[PDB]
Design a protein around this ligand. Structure first.
Ligand SMILES: O=C1c2cc(ccc2O)S(=O)(=O)/N=C2\Sc3c(Cl)ccc(O)c3N2CCCCCN1C1CCNCC1
Ligand SMILES: Nc1nc2c(ncn2[C@@H]2O[C@H](COP(=O)(O)OP(=O)(O)O)[C@@H](O)[C@H]2O)c(=O)[nH]1
Ligand SMILES: [Mg+2]
Length: 169
């Protein structure tokens, strides 16, 4: 058993809850109250390791929050989610990365950039712009659909793999 403390952040409505609940409970939620902040624990096997994932699905995204500072201190990896049909949510990404780096007082922050809602046809964020942003940060970029489950496990398992790479640096 190895524990991994993951935190899902991103603007309201991008699919943080839907992604987390798809991973843990294998169903898509259409109407999950946006103010619910809670953790979900589950054992999974990734690269031959039995992993305990302890995932915090965050609700409020306010800068000034003692509890956000605390979960940024405690969290080991961060899933930074935007929606591919919401340019503003893509612009919010750099603020989250900045907040997390400040709390960690480190450049070494395990992070995965997730462009969710890949099933929606009216894209506003070009995949290649998101790939450029991820490259600039030195982090993986994955597009997911919580609705169809596309790359949901990939997003969270990639974040686990990032935490291991960092545990050796
Ligand atoms: O009271 C909380 C709660 C607790 C905390 C932060 C935010 C938050 O909404 S905490 O920092 O004191 N606990 C953490 S941080 C954390 C991380 Cl970074 C990953 C996985 C975690 O499980 C985790 N936790 C504990 C889980 C907090 C759940 C959210 N929560 C209440 C707890 C009582 N039941 C309703 C949700
Ligand atoms: N089409 C589509 N809708 C999604 C997807 N993920 C979430 N949603 C919807 O977007 C809305 C917000 O999702 P939610 O998970 O509550 O967002 P959160 O505020 O980031 O937790 C809900 O109506 C979801 O059903 C997705 O991958 N595709
Ligand atoms: Mg939510």
């Amino acid at each position: 058993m190895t524990e991994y403390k993951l935190v899902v952040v991103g603007a309201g409505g991008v699919g943080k809850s839907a992604l987390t609940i798809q991973l843990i409970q294998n169903h898509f939620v259409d109407e999950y109250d946006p103010t619910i902040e809670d953790s979900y624990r589950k054992q999974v096997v990734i690269d031959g390791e039995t992993c305990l994932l302890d995932i915090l699905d965050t609700a409020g995204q306010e800068e000034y929050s003692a509890m956000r500072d605390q979960y940024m201190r405690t969290g080991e990896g961060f899933l930074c989610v935007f929606a591919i049909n919401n340019t503003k949510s893509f612009e919010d990404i750099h603020h989250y990365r900045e907040q997390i780096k400040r709390v960690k007082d480190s450049e070494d922050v395990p992070m995965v950039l997730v462009g969710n809602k890949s099933d929606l046809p009216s894209r506003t964020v070009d995949t290649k712009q998101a790939q450029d942003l991820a490259r600039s940060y030195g982090i993986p970029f994955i597009e997911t659909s919580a609705k169809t489950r596309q790359r949901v496990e990939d997003a969270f398992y990639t974040l686990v793999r990032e935490i291991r790479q960092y545990r050796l640096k």
